[PDB]
Amino acid sequence: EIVLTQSPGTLSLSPGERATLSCRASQSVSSSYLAWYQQKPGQAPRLLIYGASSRATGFPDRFSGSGSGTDFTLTISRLEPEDFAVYYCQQYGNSPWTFGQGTKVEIRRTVAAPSVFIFPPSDEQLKSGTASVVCLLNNFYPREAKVQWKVDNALQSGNSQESVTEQDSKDSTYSLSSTLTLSKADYEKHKVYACEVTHQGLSSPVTKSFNRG
Amino acid sequence: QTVVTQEPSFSVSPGGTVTLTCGLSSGSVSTAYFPSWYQQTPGQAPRTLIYGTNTRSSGVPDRFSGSILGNKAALTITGAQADDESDYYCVLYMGRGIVVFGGGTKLTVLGQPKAAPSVTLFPPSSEELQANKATLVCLISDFYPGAVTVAWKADSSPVKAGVETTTPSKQSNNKYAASSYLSLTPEQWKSHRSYSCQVTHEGSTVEKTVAPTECS
Amino acid sequence: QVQLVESGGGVVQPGRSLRLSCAASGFTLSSYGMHWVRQAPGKGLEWVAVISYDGSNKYYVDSVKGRFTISRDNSKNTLYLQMNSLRAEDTAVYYCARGWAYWELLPDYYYGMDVWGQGTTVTVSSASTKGPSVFPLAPSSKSTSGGTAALGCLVKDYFPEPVTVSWNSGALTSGVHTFPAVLQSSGLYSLSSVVTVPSSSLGTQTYICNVNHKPSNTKVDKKVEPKSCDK
Amino acid sequence: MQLVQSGPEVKKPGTSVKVSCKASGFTFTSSAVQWVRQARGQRLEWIGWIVVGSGNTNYAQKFQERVTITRDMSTSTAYMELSSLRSEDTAVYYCAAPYCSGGSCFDGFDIWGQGTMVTVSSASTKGPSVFPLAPSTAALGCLVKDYFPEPVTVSWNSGALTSGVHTFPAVLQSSGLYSLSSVVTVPSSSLGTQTYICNVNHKPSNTKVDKKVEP
Amino acid sequence: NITNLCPFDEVFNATRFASVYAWNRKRISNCVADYSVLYNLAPFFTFKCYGVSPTKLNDLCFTNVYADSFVIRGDEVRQIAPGQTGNIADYNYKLPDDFTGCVIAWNSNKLDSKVSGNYNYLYRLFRKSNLKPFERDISTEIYQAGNKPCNGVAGFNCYFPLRSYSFRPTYGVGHQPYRVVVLSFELLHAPATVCG
Ligand SMILES: *[C@@H]1O[C@H](CO)[C@@H](O)[C@H](O)[C@H]1NC(C)=O
C-alpha cells in the first residue's frame, strides 16, 4: 500500500528546467484517484492536479502531466520564480488513504566559505543558564552539513543543538549554526574548545577558542 | 468486486467469552447491509443463528449476541461449550441480487489435550508388484489436532514424486486419521535400499521405514 | 412439517444437462422465495441462484449467467433447476433454502433463508465407470512388534463413489477403520479398510473382505493373510 | 470558500482533546471532510475521513482506537476527540473538504484550513531568558533560552533593517524546552558607532524584555 | 340500507407495517365508511386536515380513496406537509400543494422499539433530483456523485445510501418512532365510490 518513494529527491535547477515529478504505486490505482499537492512553508498545501488528469480551477498554466497506472508523471518547464517548494503524492481509492514522501527543488549557487569566524561565551555564564558555545555560519548552499568539535579532553556527542534556516528570498541561500550546550557547573574540565566545519571547497579550517577564565 | 474478510480460526477454553468479527475491505458495514450469522458442521446442513443483527433464531440459546463494532459485524459468545466448535459464516447483502459470504471461521473449544499419533505402513503386495505397479501406504491414526505434515525419504533423500495425501477426517473416537500413498514402479522400488515415511504432528516427528529386502 | 427434498444429484459427464428437483412439504412455495446455494468440499459456501415469491424477477451470479435456468411449479409445488454446459468446477453439494414471505412485508433486496433441507451432491466428472481393483494388505513380519497388528484390504482405481466394504460378511465391526477415498491424478478413487486384531489371532482365524460397487454392480471377495516371510 | 479552525492550545499531557472545523461558502447538506496530521519538518500522515449523510469513518493502522469524530450538523462544523495521543504529537491538524452544490461536485480537496497549535509539555509558561552577544566586517546578536514555544518576535528598534537578520527556528532540548537566536553582521567597520537592541516580547503572558548590546 | 362496511381495521390494526421508502398502495371500493370509531385511539393522536371540515364527511359521496401508511422518526412529523422543503419531503415523499384530505399520526413506542434496538426502517439519502408528489420510486443501485465512473465499487463519492434508523428502547420524543397514515380520496364525484 505504501511503496510510493518518489524517485526525485534533492535536485537544484535554474529557470529553464525540465523537471519531472513521478509517484510510484503499490498497485494499479485508477485514474482520477491521485492528487499532487503544493505546500509552501508557512501555509497549507494547495490542490493543483488530481489524478494526472487535469489542472485545478485557477492556477498557473504550462505545467501538467499524465502518468501510467503505476508510474504517474508530470512535467515542469520554465518555472516562474515562486514555484520553488515541496510537492506531495496523495492517494485515493484504497483504505487507508496514505500519503507520499515529498520532493524539494532549489537552484545552483556557490558554497565556498561560510564560517571564518567564531564567538566565545560571555563571562556571565558563572550564574547564567547553561554553558553553551555558539558557532555560526552564513551562506552555505547545500542541505547537507557536517560539523565537528574538539573539546579539551572530552569526546562526547550526546547533546548538541544545531539550527538551520531555509533559503533566502533575495538569493536562495541556506544558513545554519551550532549552539552546543555542555556542562556548566564544572567549567573546569573543559578549557579548549573547537567548532570545525568541512566542505570540499573549504578544505580544513581552524577554530581555536581563546582559553576561558 | 467486493470481498468480505473474516478471521481464519480461533481456539478458546470452555466457559469463556469470545468475539468473532466480519469486515469489509472496501468500506464500512452498516445495518442496511443486514449482517447475518450462520453455523455449519461438516457433512450436515447449516443452522440459522442470527438475523436482524440483534435477533436470535427460534430455539437459539441466549448465550449468543450480535452487534456492530466500528465497521465490523461482531458476534459475542459467553460460556464456551464443546458443541459450539464448528464453522461460522457471515452473510452480507448488496442491493437486488448480490449477497456475499465471508471467508469462514473455524471455532474450536480447548478441551482434550494432545493425543499420540499412530503410524502403520504397508509395502506393495506381491500380487501388486507382479502387476508392474507399486504403492506404499503410510497411514496415521488417532492424532489430535489435525495439523499434520508428511514427508518421504528414499536412501535418506527426499522424495516428492508419486506422493498423494489424504485430508484428515474426524473419527468416532474424537480423533483424526488419514494416509499417504507413494506410487512407484517396481524397478525404482528395488533401486533404493530403504524407504521411510515421516510424520510431523504438533512438533512430534515419527519415522517409519521398510526395505525391499523385507519383501524379497 | 416444513421439509425439503432435493433429488437429481449424481455424476455426469462434462458439458451435459440435468434437472435438479426440489419438493416442499408443509407449505406452498408460492408464498416464499427459494434459494439454491452450493458448497464444494474443501471450500466455502457460494451463492448460486434465487427466485422471489412472485416469479417476476430472477438473478444469478456472474459465473453462471446465461448457462443455467431456474423454474417453479405452483400446482404441484415443485422447484426445478436446469443445469446446462456443466464444467468440472461445479462438483459440489447443493441446498435449497426458504426465506421470508410477502406474508411479512419487509423492505426490498429481501432478507434471505431461515432453514433448508439436506441437499444433494453432483460431480462433473469425465472419468469412465469401471469396476474396482482389490488387493490384500498384510503387515510386515517386522510390523508385528506389539500385541495388536493391523491387516486390511486396499481398493483402487474405481469409479464412481461410493463403494461398500465389509469384513467376514459383516461379522466383525470392532477395530475397523475405513478411511475416506480420495481422487487421484487419473480421476479415479482409492481407499483402504484396516482392522486391528491381536497377535494370537494370526493363523487361527480366516478373514475375508467383501467389496461391493452398485454403479458397476460388482461384488468381490478377497482373503486377507499376514504374509509369513518364511525362508 | 471559508474554513475556520480552533485557536492555539497549551494543554496538559493526558486528558482529552477538542478540535473543530467549521465550513462555509458551499452547500453543506452533502460533502466530505478529511483530517490529517503534520509536524514541523516532518512527514504528512493520514488520520480520518467523514461527511453529513451518515456517521461513517475509517482510521489508519495507528489510530483505530482512541479517535472519534462528531458530525455536529448544526452551524456547519464538525469536531474531533492524551484522543489519548502521546506527548510526541505536537503537530498541526488542518482541515479539508471539497466544494459541493446540488449533489454532483468535485472530487479533490480544494478547501483547506489554516492550522492549529497543540502543545503538550511541562506547562510552565514564563518569560524567556534573553541574553546578549557582545561582538568580537563583524557580527553580533541576541540569544534566548527557556524560550517557550509561543512564536516570539525579536525586533531591531526600528521594525526594519532586514539586511542580514537571522531568525532561527526552535528545536527540542533535553528538558523538553525550546531556545532560539537572532544574529546580524555589521555592514562595515563601525562597531564604535550606533547601537542595536534585543527587544523581545511575550504575548500570552505579556512580558517585554529590553537591553543594550555592547562589547 | 346495506349493512356492508369498508374494511379498515385490517389496515389500522395491521399485523406489520411498511418501510420508510416504498409503501403499500391499497384500494378500497363499494362500501360505506364510518370513521367515528377512528376516534378511539391513544391520546397521542394527531388528526389535522385540509379541504373539508373534519367531521362533515359521512354525508359526502365522493370518489375512490387510496390507502398507504408507514413509520417516521419523531420530530419531522411536521416536516411532512403540503409543499414545504425537507430531506424526506424532497427525497422520499412529497404532497401536492392543492391536496384534499389529511393524515393521521400516533405513537408506537412499545410495539416497535427493542431493548437492543430494532434496525428495520430506512430511507433514501442521495437522490440527485426532487421527485414529484405521488410517483413510485423503488431502487437499490449505489448512488454516484457523477464526475468519473465509480463503476459499482462503493468508493469515494460513489456512496450506497439509506442509513437505517436506531429505534432505541428509551429515548426522547424527538427520535421516537411514530406511525403515520396518509389518506387520499379523489373528487369530481362521477366515479362515486364510498359515500355514506
Ligand atoms: C385494534 O384492536 C383493539 C383490541 O380490541 C381495539 O381496541 C382497537 O379499537 C382496534 N383498532 C381499531 C382502529 O379499531
Author numbering:
A (entry chain P): 1 to 27, 27A, 28 to 212
B (entry chain N): 1 to 216
C (entry chain M): 1 to 231
D (entry chain O): 2 to 52, 52A, 53 to 82, 82A, 82B, 82C, 83 to 100, 100A, ...
E (entry chain B): 331 to 526
Task: Give the exact sentences the study uses for this entry.
To provide insight into effective neutralization, we determined cryo–electron microscopy structures and evaluated receptor binding domain (RBD) antibodies for their ability to bind and neutralize B.1.1.529. Mutations altered 16% of the B.1.1.529 RBD surface, clustered on an RBD ridge overlapping the angiotensin-converting enzyme 2 (ACE2)–binding surface and reduced binding of most antibodies.
(C) Docking of RBD-bound VH1-58–derived class I antibody B1-182.1 onto the B.1.1.529 spike structure identified four substitutions with potential steric hindrance. Structural analysis indicated that CDR H3 residue 100C, located at the interface formed between RBD and antibody heavy and light chains, may determine their potency against B.1.1.529 (left). Of all the antibodies tested, all VH1-58–derived antibodies retained reasonable levels of neutralization against B.1.1.529, whereas some members of other antibody classes suffered complete loss of activity.
